[PDB]
Subunit: 261 residues, 4 copies
């Protein structure tokens, strides 16, 4: 089919990319970075996130693969020594696909912008204090004062979410998880403290109390948003598709990354 290969850009990843292109040339495979059906990412999870966001308008028509030239990643979970076997099996194309849930962020002004996250979307304040009202399915839940908030996909839970004390959830669960960053708690301000796990179709809305300027991040991309009226989180109806060429279970991947390999 049509395929493309993105590279981290160091010698190791560029040379592996050139060798995989050469290997693909021995098959009925066309290099096309406009309408690829296979997107191979060579580098780390950061390289993989840029690949996902490069092609997030054609998610339904792409199977993603990650190769880690450094340490094992959660998306770049195949070693460079398997690249030749990868080329072979991608060429035949009878592999299977597994799908992970994604997070949809909607930002409203006083106008609207939507974003897909593969790891998480976070909200912080633009210098001053961060106060927002947290609304769950039109129900006012809490007034949060602190550093900010983080909404994670399931596969995002091993990333920023983990550093904030959130739970790791198996990515077959269609959910999103909200974690707090340094919440103020006394007898004036009061937050739940615990991470919150939301199913599909639940809508978490963040509403400004005073200042309406926020620094909003989506995966690696962080930009200052002004005149914000509302930030809405929900599990996306879209999903990322991976080419499956072996059994590498999520919990083993968690074990290899955090316990021992």
């Amino acid at each position: 089919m049509k395929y493309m290969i993105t590279s981290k850009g160091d010698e190791k990843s560029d040379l592996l990319r050139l060798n995989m292109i050469a290997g693909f040339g021995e098959y009925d495979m066309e290099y096309d970075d406009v309408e690829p059906e296979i997107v191979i990412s060579i580098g780390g999870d950061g390289t993989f996130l840029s690949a996902f966001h490069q092609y997030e308008e054609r998610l339904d028509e792409i199977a993603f693969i990650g190769i880690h030239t450094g340490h094992l990643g959660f998306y770049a979970d195949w070693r460079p020594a398997e690249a030749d076997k990868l080329v072979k099996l991608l060429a035949k194309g009878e592999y299977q696909k597994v799908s992970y849930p994604l997070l949809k962020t909607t930002v409203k002004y006083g106008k609207e912008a939507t974003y897909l996250a593969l790891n998480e979307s976070t909200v912080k304040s633009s210098g001053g204090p961060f106060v927002v009202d947290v609304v769950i399915n039109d129900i006012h839940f809490e007034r949060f004062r602190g550093d900010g908030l983080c909404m994670s996909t399931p596969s995002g839970t091993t990333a920023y979410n983990k550093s904030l004390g959130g739970a790791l959830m198996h990515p077959s669960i269609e959910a999103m998880q909200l974690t707090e960053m340094a919440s103020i708690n006394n007898r004036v301000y009061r937050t739940i403290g615990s991470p919150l796990v939301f199913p599909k179709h639940h809508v978490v809305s963040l509403q400004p109390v005073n200042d309406k300027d926020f620094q909003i991040s989506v995966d690696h991309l962080s930009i200052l948003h002004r005149d914000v009226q509302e930030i809405r989180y929900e599990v996306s109806a879209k999903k990322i598709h991976f080419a499956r060429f072996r059994s590498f279970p999520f919990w083993r991947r968690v074990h290899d990354s955090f316990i021992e390999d």
Copy 2:
């Protein structure tokens, strides 16, 4: 239908129980605590847990209701002033039902015993140090040394799980959550630290390293188990059914219990 009412046993709950029995007598309703189809619990969440476990062999044929005579409970979530309206609507019996997931614990010896938890099942050691091997779907995940482990249902997450830093998950999610109690972590022992959220059909197995005697709890019931070979956790195929007579959303119930009411 056939119904029964369990009471916490103080004056307040016994008198409310007698008044509801009197109210039920005005309808085609029979009191039967052997094969009830409606089990009303009057007291707190602890009273409700005993009601669930009193009838856990007829879960498929029972709708549960809880009335809190003290503070709002997560299962006893209706006020005594609504008891008359409750009798009325339970008598007609066109109410709807909502189902929550349950946790199945299997304990193997060198023989087998199974238990259903509505909140959680926990494992601790019988005096000495607690060391177990944690196996996830036949994959050795970690060697845990510490005080113990807790496996929570979704509706259990607001209970012991919350005090251990676990996430609160909406009970429409068919999952279980594993949290650590005081894990030892250095460059000898190593655990994941984070709460772990498991979907249906995943099996978490705890296996003894040295001592094989453990104190195992299931909801309020804690008993010493000897000659234990394995403890297995999975989401039960069984579910608890509640009679639904109003909209009291889980997240509002979380808000009213932990934030403000």
Copy 3:
């Protein structure tokens, strides 16, 4: 003596300030905001922090007092109804003094700047990733990757330090406490995780790994520092002095703020 009164600036605090000035006029007391010996702060703990920093060059010659016109503060811990009794006892001037430790921050470039904190000093990155080497008394302790770090005085421990999971320490202890903000931990990056409590004369040094631009905060003041070579923390030899006019124990103040009042 010479005194001055700073005000939060709302009606309530300005009017209390004018009334205390009037009351002071009945005694041998001179208003002087250049060389005061008594600095009264009317507002909240934030107003008190500005008062401290307004006069941090004459700390050895000033006794501070805080009045809270809103909720109880940890530095503004006297109610407005006691202002008349405060004027009386400050005028006679046989009150006693209690001293709290302070935190000295040194920032070195490639030049040097020093700062005193009453609550804490925090270090974060200027947009990009935050990586620093943590050196304790010339001993390399850890390579920290995460959101940032916070070094708190004892009286600062109830503030930002508390939201980061740090311990509350009685301010009679001459120490400083280092807490992490969202540290990355796997088998590549490794931090201690726990808050660290340091005695007098211990020096904690933060050293850049790659990027040398940091956002450094000292109490309420946060400024971007460029070309930073080192950030050094140690317990200051200077101390803040409070006028003591009653017994309001620190632990009771903790109780009233976080448990119940």
Copy 4:
């Protein structure tokens, strides 16, 4: 002087003990396990704790030394290869001493018993729920409901205290630290959550609310206490003395145990 050597009891530690006794025989040193002035512990930190408690009535007249035959301990912090150099320098006896603070626990009935802890003293319930009133210097601070409480010395902070989220404090600080085990927090029960660090002469008292039977631990020793009226914690006036034969800083010891060695 008079010395004695305790051993973990495995081959490795017994043989090292016999060799050190032989080496000591070449000097004016007498083996005496009744009134030793030097107590050498060979094994791990657990062996060292038994040595301390074996001789806790002669703490003022003993310098302790620990040798780790397994992994580095915080009290057993010298390697077996240094045992010959240890014998030499202990024999001459111009070494220096460093002292660590200790924790005094008082248990009152309806009679009194006192205990010294080198690591920590913990309180849990005897099966049923654990509810105690926490009193700080005769001031009621909180009503704690949960699994239990832990009061740690400074050198104890790297042990159980660390697993409960407490801070690590340098043992030159004369203090004790109170950490919670799985506290219940809602709008009925309310605890501070944060670890609490107390200076010398502060007294923390635990008082029963209903049940008066508790499982109290002091270092490795845990015994059921009945008819308990009060548990009192304070920094001991006694101190443990170590023979100092090299520079092995506490923070480096923390680094080697938890970060890398």
